[PDB]
Amino acid sequence: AQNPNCNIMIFHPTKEEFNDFDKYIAYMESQGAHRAGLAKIIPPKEWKARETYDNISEILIATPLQQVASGRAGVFTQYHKKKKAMTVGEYRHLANSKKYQTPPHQNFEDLERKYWKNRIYNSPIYGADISGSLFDENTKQWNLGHLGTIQDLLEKECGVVIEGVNTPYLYFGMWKTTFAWHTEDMDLYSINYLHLGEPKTWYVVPPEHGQRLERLARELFPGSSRGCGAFLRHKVALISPTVLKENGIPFNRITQEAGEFMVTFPYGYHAGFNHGFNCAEAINFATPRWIDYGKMASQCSCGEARVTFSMDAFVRILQPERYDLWKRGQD
Numbered sequence: 209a210q211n212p213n214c215n216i217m218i219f220h221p222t223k224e225e226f227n228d229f230d231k232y233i234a235y236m237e238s239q240g241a242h243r244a245g246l247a248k249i250i251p252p253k254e255w256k257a258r259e260t261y262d263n264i265s266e267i268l269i270a271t272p273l274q275q276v277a278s279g280r281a282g283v284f285t286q287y288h289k290k291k292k293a294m295t296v297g298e299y300r301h302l303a304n305s306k307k308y309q310t311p312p313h314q315n316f317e318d319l320e321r322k323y324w325k326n327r328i329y330n331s332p333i334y335g336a337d338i339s340g341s342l343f344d345e346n347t348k349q350w351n352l353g354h355l356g357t358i359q360d361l362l363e364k365e366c367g368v369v370i371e372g373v374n375t376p377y378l379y380f381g382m383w384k385t386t387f388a389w390h391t392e393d394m395d396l397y398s399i400n401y402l403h404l405g406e407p408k409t410w411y412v413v414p415p416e417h418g419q420r421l422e423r424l425a426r427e428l429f430p431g432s433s434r435g436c437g438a439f440l441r442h443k444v445a446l447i448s449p450t451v452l453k454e455n456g457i458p459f460n461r462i463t464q465e466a467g468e469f470m471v472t473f474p475y476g477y478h479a480g481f482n483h484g485f486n487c488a489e490a491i492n493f494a495t496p497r498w499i500d501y502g503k504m505a506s507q508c509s510c511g512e513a514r515v516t517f518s519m520d521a522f523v524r525i526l527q528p529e530r531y532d533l534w535k536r537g538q539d
């Protein structure tokens with residue numbers, strides 16, 4: 209069995225290996241990369257996502273989200289308070305202001321310490337989930353707006369033709385902006401490219417141990433657990449590495465820098481934070497190996513998780529027993 213300790217693997221494809229996306233994903237899995245839940249892919253030196261970022265400040269963040277925390281430093285939830293629209297230029301200036309800027313630090317480890325110590329005492333503003341792409345249309349390799357669609361994959365594997373579309377999303381971050389513990393919708397893969405700026409630290413639980421994290425989360429967030437049998441789908445709960453280690457939960461960590469891709473694998477729980485002003489692009493995708501995870505994915509039916517149009521068909525075809533209850537949650 210490849211990668212039996214479920215370590216995060218880092219890949220350095222050549223320019224030739226970077227041509228066929230699906231083939232490279234399947235290669236990484238042949239080496240056991242999925243067992244970690246997360247892999248890093250460093251593009252060949254000849255590749256670029258676009259020519260420059262000199263012209264992005266006019267993008268609009270229509271609904272910036274202020275991430276307000278409740279709890280204790282290692283075990284907290286966050287809620288998103290909607291703020292007035294601002295441009296990326298405005299948001300960058302805000303990120304760099306004395307109130308929001310990254311503090312002086314020695315290295316990534318010192319910064320990680322500071323994040324876990326102090327996160328809850330601040331409310332950083334995240335420009336998340338913005339439909340769009342920063343890949344040049346002429347970038348032919350690993351262009352996250354030109355991937356094969358999940359609808360087409362389900363059609364190829366299962367023969368059924370369904371409605372829905374699959375487009376990328378931009379994320380503008382600042383110091384302390386946080387992504388809560390989650391798997392993807394329908395336990396899909398994700399791919400995330402850090403276009404520019406400061407790093408992003410990731411934490412991940414191997415898919416084979418995801419239920420250990422869920423059981424801890426039910427213990428740590430007992431009201432939430434009574435409200436919903438899949439409350440991590442609400443994407444609000446944080447648990448620190450120290451707390452994970454105290455409770456024997458297997459996990460790994462890695463820091464993504466600008467110019468790097470990360471892939472999350474089906475049912476790989478992940479969480480993390482941004483080091484400073486940055487911009488990432490991400491999208492969900494599927495492979496044939498996903499289909500069995502899609503069929504078994506938990507679902508939030510309490511009404512909180514509220515998701516895209518395209519998840520309807522995935523539930524309807526892969527989980528017909530659950531469909532009626534899940535759709536009641538959506539409506």
Ligand SMILES: O=C(O)CNC(=O)C(=O)O
Nearest residue numbers: 379387398399400488490
């Ligand atoms: O970058 C972020 O804030 C969160 N991204 C992801 O969870 C992902 O790419 O799957």
Ligand SMILES: [Mg+2]
Nearest residue numbers: 263264266267
């Ligand atoms: Mg612009």
Ligand code: NI
Nearest residue numbers: 391392398472
């Ligand atoms: Ni994710």
Ligand SMILES: [Zn+2]
Nearest residue numbers: 436508510512
């Ligand atoms: Zn719910």
